[PDB]
Each structure stands twice: as C-alpha cells, then as structure tokens.
Design a protein around this ligand. Sequence first.
Ligand SMILES: CCCCCCCCCCCCCCCCCC(=O)OC[C@H](CO[C@@H]1O[C@H](CO)[C@H](O)[C@H](O)[C@H]1O)OC(=O)CCCCCCCCCCCCCCCCC
Lengths: 63, 115, 101, 69, 57, 164
Amino acid sequence: LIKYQAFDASTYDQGVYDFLTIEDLNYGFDRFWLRRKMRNHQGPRVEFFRILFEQFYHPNFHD
Amino acid sequence: VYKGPASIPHASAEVFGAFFLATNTALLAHMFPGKLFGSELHVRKWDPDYLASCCNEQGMRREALSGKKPNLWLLGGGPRLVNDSWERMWWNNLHWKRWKVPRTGPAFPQDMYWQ
Amino acid sequence: LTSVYARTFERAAFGFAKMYLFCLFMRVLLSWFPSIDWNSQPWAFLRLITEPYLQIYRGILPPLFGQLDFTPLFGFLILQDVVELMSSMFWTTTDIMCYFD
Amino acid sequence: TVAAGAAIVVPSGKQVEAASLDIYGRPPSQLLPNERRAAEFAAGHRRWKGFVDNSIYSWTRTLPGHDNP
Amino acid sequence: TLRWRKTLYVASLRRGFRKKSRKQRILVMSLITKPTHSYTVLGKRASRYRHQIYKDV
Amino acid sequence: RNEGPMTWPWKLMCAILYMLPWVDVTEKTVYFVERFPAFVWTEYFSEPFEHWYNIHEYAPLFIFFATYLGIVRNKKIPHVARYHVMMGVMLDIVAMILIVTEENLPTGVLWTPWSDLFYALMFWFIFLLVIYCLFFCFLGWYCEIPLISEGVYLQIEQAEQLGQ
Ligand SMILES: CCCCCCCCCCCCCCCCCC(=O)OC[C@H](CO[C@@H]1O[C@H](CO)[C@H](O)[C@H](O)[C@H]1O)OC(=O)CCCCCCCCCCCCCCCCC
C-alpha cells in the first residue's frame, strides 16, 4: 500500500474511510495479512502442503 | 571510576527506574479500565466547564437576591467591539467552546480490542 | 528411512547451530561487563563450550585492543547462512515460498 | 534594534491625524479600535518608507551595474 | 472491482515486465488450438492457487 | 582533563547523534501509534534524519569511527559531552541488538499478534531512552542509565589512556 499513509490513527469523531475500509486498517486477519512483508526471511509441489500440515494445523483442512 | 567534577549534577539510576516503570504502568492502566483493583485512572477531578457553570449559577443567584440584574461571566473572554461579523465579536468564548471534546478527552480508545 | 533421518539430522544441526549462536551472543554481551567472576559455575560452562572455538582464532585479530572480539559472530552468522545456501528477488508474481525458513 | 527600529517606526499625533483624515473621512478619537490601528500602521509605514528613501537610498545608488547571474 | 485493485497496488516493475510470452506444451505418452502453457505446477496459475490456499489456512 | 560544562554547539551535535537510534528503530512506530494516537508526531519527525543517515551504506560506520577516534579519546573536550556521545553510541548498539533479535524470531511466533507487541515494545523502549537522555543533554547534566552508564565511564577512562 506504498502510495498512501496506510494506517489509521484517528481521534474523537473524525474518522474518514474511502476505499481503505475500517476492517482493512484495524481489524483482524485483514489488517494482519496486509502487513505480511514484515515477516519475510529477507519444493513448491510437495513441501508446501507438508509444512502447512505440520506447522499450522487446523481440522477444517487437515482432519 | 572517575564520574565527573561533582559540581555538575548527576541524576541517579532510581530516577530513570521510576520513570521507566511509571510510563509503562500508566500506559497499561489507560488500556484496561475497570481492572485497577476494580477501578480506573483519571487525570482530573472536575470538568472546568462544570466548575464554571456552578460558579456562574451561584454568582447570578446571589446577584438576583441582592436586587440587581445578573451577569454571566464568559470563559475565554468578553466581546470585541467590531462591526463586521458576529463570529469576530464573540471570538474568545467561541474559541473556548469549540475546544470542548479534546479538552474532555481521552485521545486513546476507551475500550479494549484484541488484534 | 533416509529422508526422515536426513530431515531429522538437518533439524538437529540447525538447532545446535542456533544454540551456539546464542552462546556466542552471550559471550559478547557479557564481555561488556568487566567485574564478572568468570570462575563461578554458570560462567565456567559457557566459557567451556566456547573455549575451543575462540581458542581457534586468537591469532588472526592482532592484539590491537585486548577488550573484545565480535569476529565469531559474523563468522557463524555467515556460516549458518551458507548452510541455508550451500544445501531483491524478481518473480513473475508474488511467491509464497519465501515465507518459509 | 527594537528600540532603534521603534525610533524610526513610531509616529507622533500629527501623522496619526494625517493618516486618519485621508484614509477615513473622520478625525481621530471617533473610530473603532480596529480602524485606529490601520491609521497608526499607515503612519508608521510612511515613516519607514521615507527614512529608507532619504537616508539609506540617497547614497547607495551610484550605479555599479554588474553581477548578473 | 478491477478499478479498486488497480488503485491499491501496482507492480512497480524496475526490471522490465514480470509477464512474458507464453510457451505451448505438447503431450508425450475443435477449430481452435487451446493454450497448454499452464499445464505445469511451476507456472503463474499454480502460484496464484497456492497463494490463495496458504491465505485460507 | 577538561571539567567544564557543556555549551550549546556540543548540545546540538549530541542531539543529532541521539537521533541516530530513533532512525534505526523508526520502522516499528506504527505498532505503537495505532494504540496511542497522541504520539502520532513521532511518525513524521525523523524523515530527513533517515535520509541523511542513509546517503551511503558506509555512513554510520564512518560516524562511529569518527566520533570514537575524534571526540571520546580527545581529552581537551569537556567530559560530559564525551559522556553524551558515548551514550548515543551505546543506545545505537542496544537498538542493533534488538534488530538482531527480531530477525531471528521463529515462524510460529511471527504469525501471531505477539510479533506486534514485540514491535511496539522495541520502538517504545528506544524512544523512552532517547527522550530521557535528550532531556538531560539539553539541561547539561549527567544521566545514569542502569547497566549502561558504568560501561560508558569505563570506556571514557579507557579511551583516554588509549595512547600510552
Ligand atoms: C500563526 C502561524 C501558525 C503556526 C502554528 C505553529 C505551530 C507550532 C508548532 C511548533 C512545534 C513544532 C516544532 C517544529 C518541528 C520541527 C521539525 C518539523 O518541522 O517537523 C515537521 C514534521 C511534519 O513532517 C512533515 O509531515 C508531512 C506529512 O504530511 C510530510 O511527511 C512532510 O514530508 C514532513 O516534513 O512535524 C513534526 O514532526 C512535528 C513534531 C512536533 C512535536 C515535537 C515535540 C516537541 C514539542 C515541543 C516541546 C514543548 C516542550 C514544552 C515547552 C513549554 C513551552 C510551551
């Protein structure tokens, strides 16, 4: 979101939202997923699913 | 082992320790109202508008019981003697009253949300 | 069998290497403090496990200043990095395989 | 500088009457407070421009025409 | 929409185009020749599907 | 050994050298300002400092070598100014230690809000240290940080005889 000041730090009743929504700025996995380049380190066929199964287990996919 | 000339003041490490712990505790107390042994942290006792309204109430009541026409005292200041606009004439009290919501505060969220 | 054992060996070596980086990190950070007992138990064991490696290289850095060597830090950082390697980036579209270790 | 400038700038009563009587139609002490300050400023600005014209600019214009870019 | 995705993030190329001319594939054991360039797990479409799956997980 | 007080040009130079650790932690400001908007001015203050400290890759190493070899060991400069220069260098080293720590976090912790808390605490701790030391630099006094200032005194008295 490099062209904008892509955070919301607003006050009392002055919040304004135009194509950057409230949920994208400050709610949950939308806000978390928009900031994923903070957490890059700095094959694709089989190891992707194996690492996702071992690391981030969830019964709606893996059970 | 040489610290300095001893005529220049040295601040102790306890001052910084108290400053560090107090800033962190103030932030934590502002984020969680109701959990300070069941209470919260305020930065004042009375609203200035509330105090001035009480003082104006008692002042005009005492003026009225003494047989005079009562006067309202204005926060910020009285009128300017102009002739071009109403807003310029009454600018000082308007300037006090326009700042009401940030004077009341706070500038941080009043309730806790977990990201 | 070979794949499981190879993965287990890689994980164990990576963990041991990260631990040794932590030990070297401790060496630097304590080398800031001069009035230590290097004798006392905790310190003795740390020196021990770091005894030989710093003992390997105390001949390249001249005794310019006897106070401190950061050199093991750069050395082993680059070493585990090569371990990643010897084992910006322009793509066609955003690659997902770059968020894995 | 502040007092030295204020010696140049601050006008007397005759300049204030002079600056009031041409800008406005009325003599002084018959005006609003905001429109007295306009006459005072006009008198002070006239004093500044007159001082700059007769005391700084009378001898610095000897025409050394050069040093363009 | 497409307009919103265009207004948020652009590619910011810096090393030329990310997309390139497509390479047809043939199989070794209608009127129109259909594209078979994406019959691989290393292509752009497999990357987009894999990225969506990771986001869901 | 000069035991005189600080004067204003030393205070100005020390304030710029104190702006260096803020530049090294200024990426993580958004994770604190989101919760406390009254400090939103800290998002925008350090921008030309960020530009000038990154004119060359070798600029901060040159700054560290120049300050250590030309200010700290030079005994003609008053002792409190050398104290504040070495305090700026130590705060820079602490911030670089924090950067090294955040680049080695495990991938499970990195995809939780615990990483957001870690980012905010990084910025806030460096900011508190910088504000405290800048206050006592503008006063002209010594300020003693626990576990830091004793090493600063030892390094000054070591760098001084670093000749004989
Ligand atoms: C009548 C005219 C009206 C003028 C109003 C003037 C307001 C005066 C505010 C003065 C305070 C600002 C200081 C100047 C900042 C210098 C750097 C600057 O320009 O940054 C300019 C930056 C703004 O940065 C700009 O931002 C833009 C975003 O749209 C763009 O990014 C620009 O590139 C960027 O330059 O502003 C600051 O960061 C402001 C920080 C101010 C806070 C400093 C903390 C210290 C506060 C004072 C301490 C008082 C202590 C108590 C004293 C007791 C006495 C009361």
